[PDB]
Nucleic acid binder design. Sequence first.
DNA 1: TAAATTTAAATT
DNA 2: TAAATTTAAATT
Lengths: 157, 157
Amino acid sequence: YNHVFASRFAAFNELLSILKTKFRCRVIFEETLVLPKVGRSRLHLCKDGSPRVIKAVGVWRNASEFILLEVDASDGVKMLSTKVLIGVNRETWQSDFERIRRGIVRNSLNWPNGLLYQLYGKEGNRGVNHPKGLSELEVSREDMEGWGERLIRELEH
Amino acid sequence: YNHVFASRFAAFNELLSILKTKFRCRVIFEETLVLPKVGRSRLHLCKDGSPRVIKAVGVWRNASEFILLEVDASDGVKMLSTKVLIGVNRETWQSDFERIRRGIVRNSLNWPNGLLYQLYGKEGNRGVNHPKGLSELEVSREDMEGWGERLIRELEH
DNA sequence: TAAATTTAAATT
DNA sequence: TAAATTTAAATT
């Protein structure tokens, strides 16, 4: 039967489970940080006033790695995509990741595509839409699998 | 003081008045037609079920003419722009206008830019956004003037 | 330089 | 081939 999530951010975790199960993926790491205060910005905080968070997840599937970036938009402010970064370097990810967090706040909660294209090129700056209906916090058991399917599409170029 | 409109379509008429007054424009013609049934389409009718209408308005300002196209989206389905066509030919407008009505329904209430660019080129296929806040059917007396100002911008290239 | 709203190409 | 939803560049 269908799924019911507390927030948008909860659904992103159920996706990781499905990737582990149906799509044979391994989670390398999982870290969640707060978006930084950049300039006179206000969107680095949620409507209620708490720090807005972003979760990065390293993944491994069939001898190839990618990073998943997901922004906390559970307050309904903005509908961003799930970013799929291919070509990340352990030796500089922490710095690249920090620059990404800054750019997201600069562009008012919007992926810095100019930077991402700079970093990983047109074919390395990928992303996947959230499943229709998540605005209602309900997703069918098959829509959740399609979320994973559509992710493998971007990975398979 | 501010304006209150019954529907989105009512505001487009108040714009024409302001263009006559503050921006020295003359209304050449005013016709409103129903969008056609194209294929197995349903958007040529409003939510309540009545025929969806489109109003064309020929305008003259400082020895130069342009056509204004406005689609009836008072049922809240879609938020389209006000099209500003420059380079229209009396000898073929009726046919061009008909093709435009078809394309709008083909693309599911969306301006056929490919056609419009075909017809009037990049510099002749212009448009202007509706004033922020019209979703609430309330517009400030200065926002209505800005609607006309921003229209003259496109006309002045 | 920030956010907020309108628009439209995309996709699902 | 239609509509419906998600996304994002634009603009105001």
